Amino acid sequence: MPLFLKPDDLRNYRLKLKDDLKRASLLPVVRVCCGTGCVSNGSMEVLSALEEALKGIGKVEPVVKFTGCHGFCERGPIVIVSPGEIFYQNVKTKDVPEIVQKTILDGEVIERLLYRDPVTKKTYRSDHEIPFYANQQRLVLRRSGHIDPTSIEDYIATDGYEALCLAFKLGPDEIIKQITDSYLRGRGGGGFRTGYKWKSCREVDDFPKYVIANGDEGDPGAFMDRSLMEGDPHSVIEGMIIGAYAIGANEGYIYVRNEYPLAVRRLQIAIERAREYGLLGKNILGSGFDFDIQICKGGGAFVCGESSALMRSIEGYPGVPRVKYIHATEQGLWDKPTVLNNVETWANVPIILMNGVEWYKSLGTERNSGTKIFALVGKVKNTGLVEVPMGVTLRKIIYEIGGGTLKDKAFKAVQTGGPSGGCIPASLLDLSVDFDTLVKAGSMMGSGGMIVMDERSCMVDVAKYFIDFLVEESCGKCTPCREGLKVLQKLLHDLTEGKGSLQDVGLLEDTAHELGKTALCGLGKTAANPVLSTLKYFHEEYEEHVEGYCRAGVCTGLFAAKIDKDSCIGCGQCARTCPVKAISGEVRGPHVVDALKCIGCGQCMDVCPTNSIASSRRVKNA
């Protein structure tokens, strides 16, 4: 292990690594996406198969390694062969010998394994020309999908820990001055300025001090923080060293979940690589600043992401939020000064100090600089990690990047921020996605996960789902979140079952408004945002659900299907799907559904290829 006593040693070792990379540019490196989305999709098998297949090729076998999330999670297992810098999608074990023999050996690019645009009918050889990728600015995730997250050599050769060398020359005052002037606002959804947090932690003279990385990702449907911690933990470690040298902290903690074995193991491996190399421990790079990182791994709890609850969970207590009027930068972990930023906020610090403040502010809008990582999921054609500059319109993320809704159903809403945010209808698709603009609309940037709803998503059911999640994730400390959430769940279960009334809707809005202004922590205060957003923008659905009709066809028994007699192709998949066999149609011809015979369950509507069946109002007359 090379222990860099001096910054000159780090610079020279990086020079040697770059020199070897230059000589190894001709080597056919194969990198396999081993992030959570593709490991679950069966990419480890492809990794092992490629490792076995490359054995016995020439005197020097082609290199094979694993990487983090490449970004296009909808593509499944992704292997990137460096000999031609070729993007391969949906790679299976059957395709391993063919990939080796044709691409790695014969140089033949497999046409059927390349990405094809479903819109323009074009095949893309490389990842940079993919429309999903072409409309992104991958700045924080620049190394993810191209390096081995466990190999600090890849990180160093890619200008890693060099911003730490710059920070050691700048000094603690200049680092904090450059952070504030970069307008780096916290990427954990709050949007608070990172520079103010670091400065207000340096001002207080109570020692010791700590820096924390909130690797908890409590938002359901969001994985950008986990994918960052798995793609490159060293961009988090370096951030935690810069932010500690700036504020004088000597200890560092990364708070993650035990439910993330990949992230935990890769973060621990990265730390073990850092302490070997002298970047963590004692007398780092001959600067007299000793700093060491640990990893507190908790269980799965939404509230534990909250700062005050995160401190308690680290200390060895249940992660129950506590009401405090003194910020965590003055009395945080063990009542000591503590800087808590999420892993994406920490990862921007090396970018800020490496590429400069002026370059960092050149991105995004005014007061909202840099980039943001979005976990675009839901009903979108394209699902994965989307990183875009601030100020990008939601229409871009959902249509140019996302490709639109699944199949071709009409776009209805986009839930931003998760259970702590609100839905935005199709009318407001030209809003900038920076911090302030989404707040103005009543939604919230929040975690970053964007959920796309189409015509088959009932907004009453969406609000009920979010309320159920917040009921099961409430810590139960304070009366509003403990009980008013149960009241909202009762009201929303009445509406989805046809047992509602207009007075129920009015009481729902009143209860949401009173819950927002009376809860203790951020879970309860923002718990009413989905309900309030659905009420504000989709009140017609609430009125129809009061009348007993669900226009989205989600709430069971509140609708009757209607088969089109023009666009129906007579495939009969709906007939084979109906549990009560209430579908009677011409063989290889238009079909007909009996309103009285149908009960309404939605099984048929999701399998029609023509999308010719939708909800119709029930006949209560007979």
Partner 1 sequence: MRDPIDIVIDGVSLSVPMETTVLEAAQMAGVEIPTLCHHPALPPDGNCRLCMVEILRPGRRGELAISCMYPIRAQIEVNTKSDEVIRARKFVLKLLLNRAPKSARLNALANEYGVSVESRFSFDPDECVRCDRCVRACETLGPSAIGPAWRGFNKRIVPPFMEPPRQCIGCGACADVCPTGYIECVDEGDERTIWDRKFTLIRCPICGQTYTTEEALKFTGIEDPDARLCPTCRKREYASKFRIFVH
Partner 2 sequence: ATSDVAISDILCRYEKNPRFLLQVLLDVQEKFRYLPTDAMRSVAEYFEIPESRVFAVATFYKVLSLVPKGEKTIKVCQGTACHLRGGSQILNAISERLKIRAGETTKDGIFTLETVNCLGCCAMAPVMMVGDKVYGKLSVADVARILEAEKEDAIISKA
Ligand X SMILES: NC(=O)C1=CN([C@@H]2O[C@H](COP(=O)(O)OP(=O)(O)OC[C@H]3O[C@@H](n4cnc5c(N)ncnc54)[C@H](O)[C@@H]3O)[C@@H](O)[C@H]2O)C=CC1
Q: Please report where in the chains the tokens 């700048």 appear, as a residue.
A: 170
- Give alpha helix (H) positions in 41-98: 44-54, 95-98
Q: Is residue 228 part of the contact set for ligand FES (CB under 6 A)?
A: no
- Kindly indicate which of the ranges 80-88, 124-132, 178-186, 593-601 contains the residues binding ligand SF4, using the contact rule CB under 6 A: 593-601
Contact call for residues 519 and 527 (beta carbons, < 8 A): yes
User: Which residues are 339's β-sheet partners?
Assistant: 211
Q: How far is the CB of 474 from partner 1 (least distance, A)?
A: 5
Per CB under 6 A, the segment of 184-192, 202-210, 411-419, 521-529 that binds ligand SF4 is 521-529
375 binds, among partner 2, ligand SF4, ligand FES, none (CB under 5 to 8 A by kind): partner 2
Q: Across 398-460, where does the E strand assignment appear?
A: 411-416, 422-425, 450-454
568 marked as binding residue: yes
Q: Examine residue 222 and tell whether it contacts ligand X (CB under 6 A).
A: yes
- x/- binding map, residues 202-221, to ligand FES, per CB under 6 A? -------------------x
**Residue 78 interacting entry, from ligand FES, partner 1, partner 2, none, C-beta within 5 to 8 Å by type:** ligand FES
- Is 34 assigned to a binding site? no
Q: How far apart are CA 620 and CA 298, in angstroms?
A: 53
The DSSP bridge partners found for residue 591 are: 585
Residue 375 host element (H or E): strand 371-378
Q: Residue 340: which of partner 2, ligand FES, ligand FMN, none does it interact with, CB under 5 to 8 A by kind?
A: ligand FMN
Which among 258, 220, 223, 185 has a CA at the least distance from the CA of 473?
220
Q: What is the DSSP string of 211-234?
A: EEEE----STT--HHHHHHHH-TH
The Cα–Cα gap between 15 and 330 comes to 41
**Rounded to the nearest 10 degrees, what angle do helices 234-247 and 194-203 cross at?**
40
Residue in 256, 294, 220, 123 with CA at minimum distance from that of residue 472:
220
Residues 290-309 that bind partner 1 (CB under 8 A): 301, 303
Convert residues 239-278 into a mask of x (bound to partner 2 by CB under 8 A) and - (unbound).
-------------------xx-------------------
As a residue count, the chain comes to 622
Site for partner 2 in 488-527 (CB under 8 A): none
The option from ligand FES, ligand FMN, partner 1, none interacting with 217 (CB < 5 to 8 A, set by class) reads ligand FMN
β-bridge mates for residue 432, sequence order? 393
Q: Which of 100, 394, 453, 613 binds ligand SF4 (CB under 6 A)?
A: 613
Is 180 one of the binding residues for ligand X (CB under 6 A)? no
Beta carbon nearer to ligand FES, 36 or 329: 36
Closest CA to 374 of 142, 183, 189: 189
Give the residue with the Cβ less far from partner 2, 198 or 465.
465
Q: Is 466 in the site for ligand FES (CB under 6 A)?
A: no
What DSSP string describes 532-580?
Answer: HHHHHH-HHHHHHHHHT--TTS-STTS-EEEE-SSS-----TTTTT-TT
Residues 317 to 346 in contact with ligand SF4, rule: CB under 6 A: 321
Instruction: Provide φ and ψ at 291, rounded to 5°.
Output: -150, 135
**Is 181 part of any known ligand binding site?**
no
Report helix, strand or coil for 13: helix
Query: Could you say which of 57, 296, 471, 487 contacts partner 2 (CB under 8 A)?
Result: 296
Cα separation, 339 vs 251, in Å, equals 11
Using an 8 Å Cβ cutoff, are 232 and 35 in contact? no
Q: Of 103, 447, 533, 534, which lies in the binding site for ligand X, with binding defined by CB under 6 A?
A: 447
Q: How far is the CB of 345 from ligand X (least distance, A)?
A: 9
* Shortest distance, position 306 Cβ to ligand FMN, whole Å: 4
Residues 375 and 344: beta-carbon distance below 8 Å: no
What ranges make up the beta strands (E) of 227-274?
Answer: 251-257
The three-point CA angle 394-386-464 to 5° equals 65
Which residues are near ligand FMN by CB under 6 A? 186-190, 192, 214, 216-218, 302-303, 305-307, 340-342, 345, 521-523
Residue 222 touches partner 2, criterion: CB under 8 A? yes
Residues within the interface to ligand X (CB under 6 A):
186, 188-190, 192, 196-197, 200, 217-219, 222, 305-307, 327-329, 340, 417-418, 420, 444, 446-447, 522
Residues within the interface to partner 1 (CB under 8 A):
301, 303, 318, 322-323, 325, 471-480, 482-487, 490, 511, 514-515, 517-520
Residues within the interface to ligand FES (CB under 6 A):
33, 35-38, 69-73, 78, 221, 384
Annotated binding site for FMN: 188, 197, 214, 216, 218, 307, 342
Residues within the interface to ligand SF4 (CB under 6 A):
303, 321, 474-478, 481-482, 519-521, 523-524, 561, 563, 568-574, 577-578, 580, 582-583, 585, 591, 593, 598-604, 608, 610, 612-613
